[PDB]
Write a protein that holds these residues in place. Structure first.
Motif, PDB file in Angstrom:
ATOM      1  N   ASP A 174       0.713  -1.333   0.041  1.00 28.53           N
ATOM      2  CA  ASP A 174       0.121  -0.051   0.052  1.00 28.53           C
ATOM      3  C   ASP A 174       0.903   1.430  -0.074  1.00 28.53           C
ATOM      4  OD1 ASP A 174      -2.404   1.438   0.124  1.00 28.53           O
ATOM      5  OD2 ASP A 174      -2.486   1.571   2.143  1.00 28.53           O
ATOM      6  N   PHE A 175       0.903   2.152  -1.257  1.00 24.99           N
ATOM      7  CA  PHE A 175       1.701   3.228  -1.404  1.00 24.99           C
ATOM      8  C   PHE A 175       0.729   4.286  -1.573  1.00 24.99           C
ATOM      9  CE2 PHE A 175       5.994   1.555  -1.157  1.00 24.99           C
ATOM     10  CZ  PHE A 175       5.837   0.361  -1.657  1.00 24.99           C
ATOM     11  N   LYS A 176       0.844   5.524  -1.021  1.00 23.41           N
ATOM     12  CA  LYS A 176       0.106   6.608  -1.181  1.00 23.41           C
ATOM     13  C   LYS A 176       0.932   7.935  -1.775  1.00 23.41           C
ATOM     14  CE  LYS A 176      -4.020   5.569   0.491  1.00 23.41           C
ATOM     15  NZ  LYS A 176      -3.568   4.022   0.368  1.00 23.41           N
ATOM     16  N   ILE A 177       0.719   7.951  -3.362  1.00 26.53           N
ATOM     17  CA  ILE A 177       1.360   8.880  -4.045  1.00 26.53           C
ATOM     18  C   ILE A 177       0.796  10.128  -4.022  1.00 26.53           C
ATOM     19  CG2 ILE A 177       2.607   9.157  -6.371  1.00 26.53           C
ATOM     20  CD1 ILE A 177       1.472   5.633  -5.276  1.00 26.53           C
ATOM     21  N   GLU A 178       1.269  10.948  -3.192  1.00 26.95           N
ATOM     22  CA  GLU A 178       0.709  12.496  -3.050  1.00 26.95           C
ATOM     23  C   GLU A 178       1.577  13.481  -3.012  1.00 26.95           C
ATOM     24  OE1 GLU A 178      -1.840  11.882   0.525  1.00 26.95           O
ATOM     25  OE2 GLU A 178      -3.720  11.606  -0.724  1.00 26.95           O
ATOM     26  N   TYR A 179       1.500  14.563  -3.930  1.00 28.24           N
ATOM     27  CA  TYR A 179       2.451  15.763  -3.920  1.00 28.24           C
ATOM     28  C   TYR A 179       1.906  16.831  -3.251  1.00 28.24           C
ATOM     29  CZ  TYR A 179       3.387  12.930  -8.011  1.00 28.24           C
ATOM     30  OH  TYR A 179       3.529  11.798  -8.909  1.00 28.24           O
ATOM     31  N   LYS A 180       2.674  17.224  -1.872  1.00 28.50           N
ATOM     32  CA  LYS A 180       2.085  18.263  -1.317  1.00 28.50           C
ATOM     33  C   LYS A 180       3.344  19.253  -0.989  1.00 28.50           C
ATOM     34  CE  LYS A 180      -0.935  19.477   2.601  1.00 28.50           C
ATOM     35  NZ  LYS A 180      -2.212  19.909   1.920  1.00 28.50           N
ATOM     36  N   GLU A 181       3.094  20.378  -0.880  1.00 29.59           N
ATOM     37  CA  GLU A 181       4.109  21.548  -0.946  1.00 29.59           C
ATOM     38  C   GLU A 181       4.013  22.282   0.546  1.00 29.59           C
ATOM     39  OE1 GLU A 181       3.763  23.708  -4.583  1.00 29.59           O
ATOM     40  OE2 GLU A 181       4.850  21.893  -5.664  1.00 29.59           O
ATOM     41  N   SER A 182       4.991  21.912   1.219  1.00 34.60           N
ATOM     42  CA  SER A 182       5.073  22.728   2.628  1.00 34.60           C
ATOM     43  C   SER A 182       6.112  23.680   2.779  1.00 34.60           C
ATOM     44  CB  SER A 182       5.266  21.769   3.566  1.00 34.60           C
ATOM     45  OG  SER A 182       5.971  20.821   3.679  1.00 34.60           O
ATOM     46  N   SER A 183       5.900  24.830   3.258  1.00 29.68           N
ATOM     47  CA  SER A 183       7.060  25.836   3.543  1.00 29.68           C
ATOM     48  C   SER A 183       8.360  25.223   4.603  1.00 29.68           C
ATOM     49  CB  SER A 183       6.717  27.109   3.785  1.00 29.68           C
ATOM     50  OG  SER A 183       5.806  27.560   2.688  1.00 29.68           O
ATOM     51  N   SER A 184       8.046  24.326   5.400  1.00 27.16           N
ATOM     52  CA  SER A 184       8.774  23.839   6.578  1.00 27.16           C
ATOM     53  C   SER A 184      10.344  23.354   5.894  1.00 27.16           C
ATOM     54  CB  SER A 184       8.354  22.930   7.392  1.00 27.16           C
ATOM     55  OG  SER A 184       9.194  22.328   8.328  1.00 27.16           O
ATOM     56  N   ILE A 185      11.272  23.684   5.731  1.00 28.53           N
ATOM     57  CA  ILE A 185      12.699  23.463   5.560  1.00 28.53           C
ATOM     58  C   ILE A 185      13.398  22.397   6.535  1.00 28.53           C
ATOM     59  CG2 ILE A 185      13.100  25.065   3.628  1.00 28.53           C
ATOM     60  CD1 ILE A 185      14.639  26.829   5.721  1.00 28.53           C
ATOM     61  N   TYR A 186      13.878  21.394   6.208  1.00 29.43           N
ATOM     62  CA  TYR A 186      14.669  20.462   6.770  1.00 29.43           C
ATOM     63  C   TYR A 186      16.176  20.733   6.873  1.00 29.43           C
ATOM     64  CZ  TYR A 186      10.454  17.790   7.862  1.00 29.43           C
ATOM     65  OH  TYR A 186       9.054  17.536   8.232  1.00 29.43           O
ATOM     66  N   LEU A 187      16.989  20.728   7.785  1.00 24.53           N
ATOM     67  CA  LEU A 187      18.128  21.043   8.071  1.00 24.53           C
ATOM     68  C   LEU A 187      18.940  20.216   9.023  1.00 24.53           C
ATOM     69  CD1 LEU A 187      16.687  23.708   7.114  1.00 24.53           C
ATOM     70  CD2 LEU A 187      19.019  25.032   7.577  1.00 24.53           C
ATOM     71  N   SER A 188      20.332  20.457   9.534  1.00 30.39           N
ATOM     72  CA  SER A 188      21.060  19.942  10.211  1.00 30.39           C
ATOM     73  C   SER A 188      20.715  19.577  11.719  1.00 30.39           C
ATOM     74  CB  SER A 188      22.700  20.139  10.282  1.00 30.39           C
ATOM     75  OG  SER A 188      22.611  21.370  10.826  1.00 30.39           O
ATOM     76  N   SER A 189      20.071  20.546  12.273  1.00 32.47           N
ATOM     77  CA  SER A 189      19.386  20.626  13.719  1.00 32.47           C
ATOM     78  C   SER A 189      18.166  21.458  13.592  1.00 32.47           C
ATOM     79  CB  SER A 189      20.541  20.923  14.604  1.00 32.47           C
ATOM     80  OG  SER A 189      19.987  20.594  15.926  1.00 32.47           O
ATOM     81  N   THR A 190      17.552  21.252  14.838  1.00 35.12           N
ATOM     82  CA  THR A 190      16.364  22.317  15.299  1.00 35.12           C
ATOM     83  C   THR A 190      16.596  23.962  15.207  1.00 35.12           C
ATOM     84  OG1 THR A 190      15.986  20.184  16.920  1.00 35.12           O
ATOM     85  CG2 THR A 190      14.599  22.334  17.198  1.00 35.12           C
ATOM     86  N   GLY A 191      17.950  24.077  15.513  1.00 40.22           N
ATOM     87  CA  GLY A 191      18.232  25.413  15.553  1.00 40.22           C
ATOM     88  C   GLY A 191      18.408  26.139  16.696  1.00 40.22           C
ATOM     89  N   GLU A 192      17.949  25.132  17.801  1.00 38.43           N
ATOM     90  CA  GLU A 192      17.998  25.768  19.239  1.00 38.43           C
ATOM     91  C   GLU A 192      19.115  25.684  19.874  1.00 38.43           C
ATOM     92  OE1 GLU A 192      14.513  23.088  20.514  1.00 38.43           O
ATOM     93  OE2 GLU A 192      13.571  24.985  21.003  1.00 38.43           O
ATOM     94  N   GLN A 193      20.171  24.909  19.531  1.00 34.09           N
ATOM     95  CA  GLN A 193      21.651  24.787  19.866  1.00 34.09           C
ATOM     96  C   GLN A 193      22.363  26.095  19.904  1.00 34.09           C
ATOM     97  OE1 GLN A 193      23.045  21.708  17.043  1.00 34.09           O
ATOM     98  NE2 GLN A 193      22.272  19.913  18.194  1.00 34.09           N
ATOM     99  N   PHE A 194      21.852  26.667  18.871  1.00 35.96           N
ATOM    100  CA  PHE A 194      22.815  28.269  18.803  1.00 35.96           C
ATOM    101  C   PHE A 194      21.473  29.348  18.706  1.00 35.96           C
ATOM    102  CE2 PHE A 194      23.916  24.958  15.508  1.00 35.96           C
ATOM    103  CZ  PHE A 194      25.064  24.412  16.044  1.00 35.96           C
ATOM    104  N   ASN A 195      21.809  30.283  19.490  1.00 28.65           N
ATOM    105  CA  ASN A 195      21.109  31.690  19.583  1.00 28.65           C
ATOM    106  C   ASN A 195      19.638  31.345  20.269  1.00 28.65           C
ATOM    107  OD1 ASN A 195      18.800  33.489  17.625  1.00 28.65           O
ATOM    108  ND2 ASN A 195      19.976  34.569  18.892  1.00 28.65           N
TER     109      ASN A 195
END
Lengths: 66, 178, 113, 722
Positions: free
Chosen positions: D76-97
């Motif tokens: 069972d595979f669900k092929i769906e194209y959804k565009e979200s503005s959330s960018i995935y990086l190395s960390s949460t960004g809370e470690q610095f600043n």
DNA sequence: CCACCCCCTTTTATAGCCCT
DNA sequence: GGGCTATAAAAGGGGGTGG
């Protein structure tokens, strides 16, 4: 060793900046306090080490794991 | 005269004149390390050539670890391309070679007790504090480190032709203090 | 930390092999405990860098009165070891003295070979 | 169970990748046995997948696919194209600043699915590596069922378009987590039915951001066989060239290199020659464009490199990057022209790496008069003086600077010249009157090669007047060094120029035998000794040289300890056997000391059967150094096993047995156990058996004679009893 | 209230002595 | 194979005394 105490303290992200005078003073203070507390446990006698942690209110902070 | 000193380290300065986001660059790159409490700059490293550049805020960069002069500029231009690939407007305003570390081996041994005597105000030699004396040549502005074994190190020169001129002046001084 | 550094001090009846690995684990745990309390001491004084004076206050709050006396005496001995570690001529007049020393040495070098 | 504990402890405490590799390999092999503890394995394996160390993630994923023999996945595979503005990086960004305690078997597959979109890059790259392994062994399924997230596609699609994490560790940049996601997308494509995935990814190539295009190119770089609209994909691939981002031109040209181009081939060249003519100080896209150009000239042989655009390929020979130098010589290999012929001879003299220059040397040995005269002048020049700027076409800071030549040294500069000199000897050469110190050492060999298809020694002072190198050094210390003659001197020029003087005297005297003996002793350079010996052997074939007094001293050269003469015997090998001097060796006692250094040269040929007496004499004096040379030949190895099995010599076996074939090792298993149980050399017989036990599972060589081959089959079947 | 130092970190060759 | 000591050069934040 001095750099051994410095590498461990700077490893954690929460600590961050640690002075040269602070790392040097703790390197001799920690080793002297541990050798004196372990020496008293040898004077009382593996099971004797757990007995020394219950005898001293000060040494009750340790022996929390293993 | 004699042999030629071979260099191993080159320190350079590059101006990018742009407010750089230290957190964004550190979060986007895998080869870049950062810790605000420990240091105020992002430390990025390159495999080819083995160089390490300190990327500070407001577009100020310090490239270190390069062996040759051309390699230091070639690395700086590669680091600028990385910053530009992140969305920041990168500009190669100026390039200045600040330090050139060189190592030279002379077959004959040196008696540092004699050289420190003749250059009493130029040298500060201690037996157990640090092996070797701190020779300070006023002009060219080069600080040399002479050892008992023979291997010497030249550091502080901003021009390449300075270490070659300094060696030709220090070599006859090392002969008389054998 | 290296285990051999703690093992040599503990040895100076034979100590057990299982206890030798346990004492080292307790040694590394004591360092993380003193550093974590000192991190709170540096934050309480609003100072970003961990000071030696801030680390001394952390030892007293934990419950080590005898260790605090040894820390104040060792720091003064370390300060004296760090502190122990006038020609008159100007930059141009001292340059003439050194350039003469380069010229004189070159002449002796020529006489040799 | 105790062995599982021994595994993951090493996989977490070890510092070396090599040890971890064998530990992972041992577990993935006996995973069929330790199947009972599958929740514990998955428990400890999760840490390997979530480890910050890039190595532990691939080892962790490797143990998972080794467990996939037990589990059965879902279609069972669900092929769906959804565009979200959330960018995935190395960390949460809370470690610095929120990892769950994995104890149940279903806990593992429920957490790794959540990790595909975690804030930490190493947790995501680990999860995508785990999923790629699950679908690698999906064919070899089991009974226990595991329902994988049907939202897996939308997770991959999101990662490719949202993740903005790159690795600039080297000039070629790569997205670690996006690459593992793109590869998973490729591994789950056959499982998905009719889709728009293959077309959708072509839409990424037109996205404004380079990181979205990068994800588009790398995905197609895995699904390159699943594409049916090849005409539509190539249309954009040509337009994708000449892009501001260097990594976009690199991937596009490399992908266009796989796809055939016949309709719009001229439009491709327009963009390729433009990037080279752009003259950019640092470019990664240059090596990929040249690989694409080679395809056009190989598939369509009608076309040729333009004359005006040939001027752009010239600075590529002096490029610092080796990957660029490798492609150039692979492009101009078929074509032969005087214009490039000069630049090919410049790589042989300058460029450091021998791998790339061997590619150039072979082209020269496969010739116009103008280059023979042009390069004979640079070789004739002094070694202490670097190469000239206007004389050479390609320029480099090394080999041209006074300080630069000190880094490579006198030995390396001569090696580069001698290698080019061997290529000149092949084709016809015209004699010229132009002469310069080390000019006479090359011109005397050049006149000798000319004579193949002698002037005596003149006054010692005459060379000081004409040459430049001898002129600067004092003759008072030079004569004392010559009168010693070995003892070193304080002067820095006496020792290197003595080697240059001995080189010149022995070469002008050529064909010579009295001046050639001292040459092989003091010569610091080994490549020149190969060139000098290459002359001698060419003369012995045409029967122009008569060397017996030199050959007699050459033999006593290796026997004494002078390794210089070894260079001569490597060139003059099998010919020594056919020579009358071979009969003389059969009486000399130095033969054991001589063959202890020159056995590797006569063992490579079938003529080793003629030298069979040396093997017998090597079995007598028991000198392993000579015996180990014959072990390279199966016939001499078989003769040894028959002697060793009859009369056991444990102290000799451990030094010869492992140097030979590992096919004869099972024959020694039974007699070695007999010694250990009977306390006969227990220490040594246990040490030698300790070498045999690991090499027991070695595949039996069928080339062995039925005399010993049948014994091996009879012994291995006996040990197979268990 | 900012200036002047001082500390901190990055790289690199060099070297005995000491320890893991 | 690292720690000890030491040198040059850029950078910039964070500290303790001075004009």
């Amino acid at each position: 060793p001095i750099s051994r105490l410095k590498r461990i303290m700077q490893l954690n992200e929460d600590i961050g900046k640690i002075g040269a005078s602070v790392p040097v003073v703790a390197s001799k203070a920690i080793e002297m306090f541990l050798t004196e507390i372990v020496g008293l446990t040898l004077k009382e006698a593996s099971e004797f080490i757990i007995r020394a942690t219950e005898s001293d209110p000060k040494f009750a902070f340790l022996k929390n794991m293993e | 005269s004699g042999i030629i000193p071979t260099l191993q380290n080159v320190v350079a300065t590059v101006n990018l004149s742009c407010k750089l986001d230290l957190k964004n660059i550190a979060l986007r790159a895998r080869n870049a390390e950062y810790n605000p409490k420990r240091f105020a700059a992002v430390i990025m490293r390159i495999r080819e050539p083995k160089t390490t550049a300190l990327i500070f805020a407001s577009g100020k960069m310090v490239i270190t670890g390069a062996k040759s002069e051309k390699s230091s500029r070639m690395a700086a231009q590669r680091y600028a391309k990385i910053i530009h690939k992140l969305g920041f407007n990168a500009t190669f305003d100026d390039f200045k070679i600040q330090n050139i570390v060189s190592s030279c081996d002379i077959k004959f041994s040196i008696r540092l007790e004699g050289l420190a005597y003749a250059h009493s105000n130029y040298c500060s030699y201690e037996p157990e504090l640090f092996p070797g004396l701190i020779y300070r040549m006023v002009k060219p502005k080069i600080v040399l480190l002479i050892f008992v074994s023979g291997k010497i190190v030249l550091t502080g020169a901003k021009v390449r032709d300075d270490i070659y001129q300094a060696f030709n002046n220090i070599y006859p001084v090392l002969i008389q203090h054998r | 930390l290296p285990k051999a550094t703690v093992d040599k001090m503990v040895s100076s009846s034979v100590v057990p092999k299982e206890s030798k690995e346990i004492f080292q684990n307790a040694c590394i745990y004591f360092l993380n405990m003193l550093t974590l309390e000192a991190n709170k001491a540096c934050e309480e004084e609003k100072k970003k860098t961990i000071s030696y004076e801030h680390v001394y206050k952390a030892l007293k709050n934990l419950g080590f009165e005898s260790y605090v006396e040894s820390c104040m005496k060792e720091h003064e001995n370390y300060e004296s070891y760090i502190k122990q570690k006038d020609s008159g001529l100007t930059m141009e007049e001292l340059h003439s003295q050194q350039i003469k020393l380069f010229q004189n040495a070159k002449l002796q070098f020529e006489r040799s070979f | 169970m105790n062995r599982l504990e021994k595994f993951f402890t090493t996989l977490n405490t070890a510092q070396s990748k090599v040890l971890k590799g064998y530990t992972t390999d041992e577990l993935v092999s006996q995973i069929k046995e330790y199947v009972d503890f599958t929740p514990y394995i998955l428990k400890q394996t999760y840490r390997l997948l979530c480890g910050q160390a890039s190595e532990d993630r691939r080892n962790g994923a490797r143990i998972l696919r080794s467990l996939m023999f037990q589990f059965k996945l879902v279609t069972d595979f669900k092929i769906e194209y959804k565009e979200s503005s959330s960018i995935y990086l190395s960390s949460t960004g809370e470690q610095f600043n929120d990892e769950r305690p994995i104890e149940n078997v279903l806990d593992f597959f429920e957490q790794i699915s959540d990790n595909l979109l975690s804030y930490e890059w190493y947790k995501r790259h680990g999860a995508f590596l785990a999923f790629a392994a699950m679908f690698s062994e999906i064919d070899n399924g089991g009974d226990i069922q595991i329902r994988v997230d049907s939202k897996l596609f939308s997770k991959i699609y999101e990662i490719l378009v949202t993740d903005k994490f790159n690795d600039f560790v080297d000039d070629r940049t790569v997205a670690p987590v996006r690459d593992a996601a793109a590869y998973l997308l490729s591994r789950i494509y056959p499982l998905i039915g009719p889709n728009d995935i293959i077309e959708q990814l072509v839409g990424f190539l037109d996205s404004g951001d380079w990181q979205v295009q990068f994800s588009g190119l790398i995905a197609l770089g895995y699904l390159k066989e699943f594409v049916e609209d090849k005409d539509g994909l190539c249309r954009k691939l040509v337009s994708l060239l000449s892009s501001p981002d260097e990594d976009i031109k690199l991937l596009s040209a490399e992908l266009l290199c796989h796809f055939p181009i016949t309709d719009s081939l001229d439009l491709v060249l327009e963009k390729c020659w433009k990037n080279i003519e752009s003259e950019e100080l640092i470019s990664v896209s240059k090596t990929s464009n040249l690989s694409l150009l080679t395809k056009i000239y190989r598939e369509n042989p009608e076309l040729s490199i333009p004359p005006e655009r040939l001027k752009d390929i010239f600075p590529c020979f002096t490029s610092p990057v080796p990957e660029v130098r490798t492609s150039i010589l692979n492009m101009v290999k078929n074509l032969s022209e005087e214009s490039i012929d000069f630049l090919v001879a410049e790589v042989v003299l300058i460029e450091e790496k021998d791998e790339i220059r061997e590619m150039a040397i072979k082209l020269l040995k496969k010739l116009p008069k103008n280059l023979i005269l042009h390069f004979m002048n640079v070789i004739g020049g002094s070694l202490y003086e670097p190469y000239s700027e206007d004389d050479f076409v390609s320029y480099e800071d090394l080999y041209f600077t006074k300080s630069g030549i000190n880094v490579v040294g006198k030995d390396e500069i001569l090696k580069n010249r001698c290698l080019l000199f061997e290529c000149i000897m092949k084709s016809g050469l015209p004699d010229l009157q132009s002469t310069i110190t080390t000019s006479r050492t090359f011109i005397s060999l050049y006149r000798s090669v000319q004579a193949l298809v002698p002037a005596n020694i003149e006054e010692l002072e005459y060379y000081f007047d004409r040459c430049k190198d001898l002129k600067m050094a004092p003759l008072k210390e030079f004569k004392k060094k010559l009168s010693a003659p070995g003892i070193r001197s304080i002067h820095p020029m006496v020792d290197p120029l003595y080697s240059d003087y001995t080189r010149m005297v022995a070469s002008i005297e050529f064909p010579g035998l009295e001046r050639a003996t001292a040459l092989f002793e003091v010569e610091t350079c080994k490549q020149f000794l190969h060139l000098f010996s290459k002359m001698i052997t060419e003369y012995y074939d045409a029967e122009k040289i008569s060397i017996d007094n030199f050959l007699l001293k050459a033999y006593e050269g290796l026997a004494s300890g002078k390794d210089g003469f070894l260079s001569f015997f490597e060139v003059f090998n099998t010919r020594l056997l056919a020579h009358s001097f071979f009969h003389k060796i059969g009486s000399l006692e130095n033969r054991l000391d001589f063959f202890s250094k020159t056995i590797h040269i006569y063992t490579k040929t079938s003529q080793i059967q003629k030298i069979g007496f040396v093997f017998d004499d090597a079995l007598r004096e028991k000198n392993i150094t000579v015996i180990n040379g014959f072990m390279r030949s199966l016939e001499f190895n078989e003769k040894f096993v028959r002697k060793a099995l009859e009369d056991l010599d444990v102290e000799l076996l451990d030094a010869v047995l492992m140097s030979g074939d590992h096919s004869f090792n099972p024959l020694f298993v039974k007699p070695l156990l007999r010694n250990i149980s009977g306390n006969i050399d227990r220490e040594a017989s246990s040490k030698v058996l300790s070498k045999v036990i690991p090499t027991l599972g070695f595949s039996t060589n069928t080339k062995i004679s039925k005399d010993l081959l049948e014994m091996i089959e009879r012994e291995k079947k006996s040990l197979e009893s268990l």
